[PDB]
Amino acid sequence: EWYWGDISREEVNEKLRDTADGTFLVRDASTKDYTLTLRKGGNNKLIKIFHRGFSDPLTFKLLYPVSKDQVVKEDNIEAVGKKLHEYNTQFQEKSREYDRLYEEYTRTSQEIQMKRTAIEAFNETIKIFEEQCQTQERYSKEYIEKFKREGNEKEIQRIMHNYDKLKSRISEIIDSRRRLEEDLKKQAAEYREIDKRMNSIKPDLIQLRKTRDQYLMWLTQKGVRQK
Amino acid sequence: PPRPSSGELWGIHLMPPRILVECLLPNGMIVTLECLREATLITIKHELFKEARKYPLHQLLQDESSYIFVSVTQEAEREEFFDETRRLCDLRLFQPFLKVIEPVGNREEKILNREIGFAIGMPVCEFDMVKDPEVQDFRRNILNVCKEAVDLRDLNSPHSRAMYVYPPNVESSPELPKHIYNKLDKGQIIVVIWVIVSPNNDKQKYTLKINHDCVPEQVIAEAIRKLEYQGKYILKVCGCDEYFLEKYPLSQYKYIRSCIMLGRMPNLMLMAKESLYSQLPMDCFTMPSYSRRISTTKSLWVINSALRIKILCATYVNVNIRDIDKIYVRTGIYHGGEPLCDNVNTQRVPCSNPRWNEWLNYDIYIPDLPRAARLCLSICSVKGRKGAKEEHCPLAWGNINLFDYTDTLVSGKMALNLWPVPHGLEDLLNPIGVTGSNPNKETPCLELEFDWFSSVVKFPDMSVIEEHANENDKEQLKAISTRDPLSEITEQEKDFLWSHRHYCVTIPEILPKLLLSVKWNSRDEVAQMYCLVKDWPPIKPEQAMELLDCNYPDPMVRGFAVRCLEKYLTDDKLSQYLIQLVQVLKYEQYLDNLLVRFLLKKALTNQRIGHFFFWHLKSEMHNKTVSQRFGLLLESYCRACGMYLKHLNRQVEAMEKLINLTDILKQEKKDETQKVQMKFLVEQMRRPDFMDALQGFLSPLNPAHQLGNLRLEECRIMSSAKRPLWLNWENPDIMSELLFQNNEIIFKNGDDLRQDMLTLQIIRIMENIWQNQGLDLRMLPYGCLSIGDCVGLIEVVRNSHTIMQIQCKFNSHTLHQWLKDKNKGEIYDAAIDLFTRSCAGYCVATFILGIGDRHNSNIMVKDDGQLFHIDFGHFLDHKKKKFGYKRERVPFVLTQDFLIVISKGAQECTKTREFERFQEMCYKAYLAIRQHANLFINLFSMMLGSGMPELQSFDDIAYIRKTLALDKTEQEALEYFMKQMNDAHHGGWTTKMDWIFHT
C-alpha cells in the first residue's frame, strides 16, 4: 500500500533516497488534498492531486510502490516496550563509542599534519647545517694549509674541534628527524585503523537507529492516540 | 604549512628563562650563545659578534651591522629577520639556531610578504610554488580590485581616508519607528557635547536640545551658539573610536538611535578635523613581483554524443575486510544540489582490490550540460548480511567542475585525492562539498578518464547562446512569489511558472521560484532563462542573497545577484550578513568571480567590513577545503588594506600568546590545582614579551574598542573544563568614564563557537525586525567571534549573574526579591518591564530556533532586570537523531520564578494583566519573525557548507519551517505557538476570539 497519511516531505525524501525511476507514494498534502511523489532522473517530483486528478478536468509511469516490511515482530506493548528499551540502550552506547572514535580520528588527523610540517622544518634545518659544513670546507682548506706550513698545531685543532661540533649537531638533528618519521609512520597506521573502525561502526549505528525509530513508531501506533 | 602549535619552539610551548642558541657564522664557524628568552636580535647579534672573536677565521667576518639573522620557523620557512627589535621568544623558531647572512633581494617586498604571511597564518611563498594556472591567474587578476579600492581611498584625501578607517556606523534608513520617535520631546533630542580644551586637556559639558534629524554639522553649529567654526570640527562618540564624519541625520547613527531607544543620554565629543586628519597615514599599495613575471577548439553544442566517464582505480580504502562485502564508485552529475540525470554506480568489487576500468554512461546529451555542471562522486561500502537488507556508507568523496575557469570541458586522464566524509553525513554523495582534489596526497586517490573529441571543447560564447531560436493566473503567481524558499513546488507549478516566464518580470521577486522551474539539463530552456536574467529588474538585497546559496550555481544567476548587492546592499546590511556572504564564497566554482571581487572591494573601502572579513577568513585557514581560496583572498586583502595590516598583526600576535598560554594550562599543567595554575598565569602575564603583545591593540570583537593596559588583578582562569581566560583591560579613551572603563573579554580555547556566533547574529536580526515594527523586545546579542579552530572571544556582559548565582545567594520568590533589592522605589517598574520584554524576546527566539534546553546556569539577568541567554551550543532538531521523537521543544519554559517577576509577586501569576501583556508581546514577536521567514531560511541556507554539524542539509532547516508553521495560515500558526506554550507550561496561555481571530 502506497498511501502513507500524515508523513512529511523529509520522510518521503528518506524513503525515495537512491531509489530507481518509477518509485512512488501518495501522502496527505503538506496542508492543501493529496500529494503524489514520483522518483524521476534522481529527483523526487511533486504532483498535486486536486479534488472538486491533476489534468484540466478532474475525471477521477508509476512502476514501483513504497509499501506500508515489519521490523517489529512482537504481539503486545510490554514486549515492544522492552525491545525498544534494549535497542535504545545499545544505540546510546554505540553513539557514545562513535563520538569517542570521531574525536580520536580528528586528534590523530591533526597530529599527523603537525608531524608532517615538523619533518619539512627538519629537512630545511638539515640543509642549512649541511650548507654550513660546505661553507666551513670552502674556507678551511686554504687556512689549514697555511697553519701547517707555519707550524700552528693548536690552531688546526681549533678549526677541527668546531667542525666536529657542527657534525655532531647535524647527526643529532638527523636522528631527531628519523625518530619523528618513525612516530609519523606509526601514527599514520593508527589513523587507518581508526578510519576502519569508524567505517564498521557507521552502518551498524544507522541500522540500530532505524530499528529503534521503528519500535518507537510501533509503540506510538498501539498506544492511546489523538492530541 | 601553518604552525603546528603557538609555542616558542617545536615541542616546547615556552622557552626557559635562559636558552642556548646555535649561531651559524658566514665563515663556517658554529658558536653556542646563551641568550635570555626575551632578548632582541640586535642584543643577540652584538653578543654573538663579540664572542665570534674567540673563534677561528674571525678575520673573514665583516662589520656586525653588515648582517641579519635567518632561521627556520615552525612553518618550515627560512625567514630573514630584517626587524632586529623582535625578541627571540617571538620568532616562532623551529629549533634554537640562527644563521648569519648578508641582506639580499628586494628588502621592502620581503618585509611586506612576512607581515602578510604573519596575518594570514601561512607563508606567501607557498603560493608561488602552486602549479595550477587558476591560482596564478587569480593572484594577478585580483590586483585590479586592490588598485581600484586604494585609488578611491586617496581620491578625496584626507576625508576619503577618514571615511575608510572610521566609516559612519548608521542604520539603513533615517525613518524612525513610532515608539522611538515618541521617546523624543517633539522630535527633539537632548545631547551632551564635550570639548577637550588644551593645554591641560579639561572636559567642558554642553547640553544641546536639537532636532533628531539634525546632520552632524548642525549639531556643531548649536554647540558654538551655547561661520568659521562650523566646518573645522568633527563629532566622536565618548569612550570609543566611532566618528560622525558623514551628512546623515544624527538619529540614523546607531549610537544615537540606541540612546533614544534606551532613554540614555548621548555623550559626544567635539574635536578639530585636523587632529584626526593628521593621525591618518597616507596608505600606499605597491604592485607585487608576481604581477611582473613571465607566466608558467570545438564548441560543446556541436559534440553529438551522450556523457560518459571512465572510473579506473583507487589507490586504497580503509575498511575492515571481515565487516564489509564490496566497494563501488557512486557518481552523479549535479547542478547545485539537484542531479541533472540519475546517479550511476560502477560494479561492486572486493575491498582489497579497488579496480573498476568501467565507462559509466549518463542519461544526458553533452550539448545539454549547463555551465555550472559538476561531477559528484564517492567510494561507498556495501554490507549485505541481514536478509536482503543492505547498508551503504560513503568512505571518501570528491567533486569536480566539468568545465574549468577558462570554460574548457574536462578531457583526458585525471587523478583525484578524495576527502574524509563529514561527521553526521549519511548521504552517499556530497554535492554541497567543495570542488577539487584533496591537497593531502596521503588519502585515497581515484583515477578517472574523461572523453576525448580530437580537440579542446569550449562552452559556447554568450552571443551564440542568445540564439532566440523559437486573470486568476496573476493571483497564483503572487501566491507562489510569497512562499518560503523551501516550500514545496509541484510539477504543475513548475510548468505554470515556465509558461508565464515573460510575465514573471512584472513580479521580479518570483525569480528564485522561476529558476527552480527551469530544466537545467536542457540547453533550449537555459538559453531562454539567460535572456530573461540579462534584462531582469533588480530585486531586494535580502532576496538576491538566496541566489548566492548552493542551490543557484549558474554564473549568470550569481552575476545578477551580485549586481543587486552592488546597487542596493548598504554597508550596515553587508556588515550584518557578512558571515553568510563569506560562507557562500565556498560554493563558487572558481577563485575569480563577481562575488569575491565585490566583497574584497567593500572590505578595502570600509575598515569595519575589512576587519570582520579578515577574521572570518582567518578563522577558517586551518580548514584544507578552503585554505587555498581563503589564503589567496586574504593575501590580496592584506596587500591593499593599508596601515590596518599593522593593527591586524597586533591582534594576531596577542591571540597567539593566549592560544599558547591556554595550551600550557590544558596540556602540561592540566593536573595542577587552580591556585598553582593562577600563580603561573600572573607570573607569565607579567613578562615584558606578554605585556608588550597584550596591551595597546584593538578589540577583535569591535575595532572601535581600544584595549589599553591589562588589569592583571581582574584576569583569571575560569572554573570550566576548557580553562577559559577572563581578561580585563582599561579603556584608554580620554572619555572612557562615559561609556565603560573596563573592557572584559573571555578567551576560550577548546569549544567550537561557530554555532553560537550564528545564533547571536540571528538574535540581533530578530531584535532589529521587532524594533522596526514597534516591538521593544530587548535582546542581548553579546559579541562572539571565532578566531580559529575551536578558539574564540566572548564579550562579557557586566553586572549580570546566572539564575543559579542569584539562588545560591532559596525558594521561587528569591529571583523577584533579588530584583527588588537591586531596583528600589521609583526604578522598580522599569526593571519588571525590562525583564518582561526581554523574557518575551528570548521565549520566542529560542522556540523558533530550537536552541539547547535552558536551565539556571545558561540564563542570566542584569541588575536592571534585563534577562538574556548564554551558551546556545545547539539549535534546530538536535535531538531527532538521538531520541527519534517528532516534536518542537520549548527550550525556555517560564517557571514560577519567572512568572512571579512578570506578575510582581501576585498569587495567581497567569491571571494578571502583566501576564496577558507578556503573552501579547510573544504573539506579536512570533508573527513578526514568521512574516520575515524568507530571510531566516536564506541565512541558514547560506551556512550549509560551513561545516557546522547541526546545519548540514536543507532538511535540517525544515525545523524552522515547523516552528514558524509556514505551511499553515497566520491564524493557525498563532494557534500552534499558543498550543506549544500551553503544552510546555501546563496551561495559562490565552487569546481573543477563535473563529476569525478578532478581539
Ligand SMILES: Cc1nc(NC(=O)N2CCC[C@H]2C(N)=O)sc1-c1ccnc(C(C)(C)C(F)(F)F)c1
Ligand atoms: C556574556 C557573558 N557575561 C558574563 N558575565 C559574567 O560572568 N559576570 C558579570 C558579573 C560577574 C560575572 C558573573 N556573573 O559571575 S559570562 C558571559 C558568557 C557568555 C557565554 N558563555 C559564557 C561561558 C562561561 C559559558 C564561556 F563560554 F565563556 F565559557 C559566558
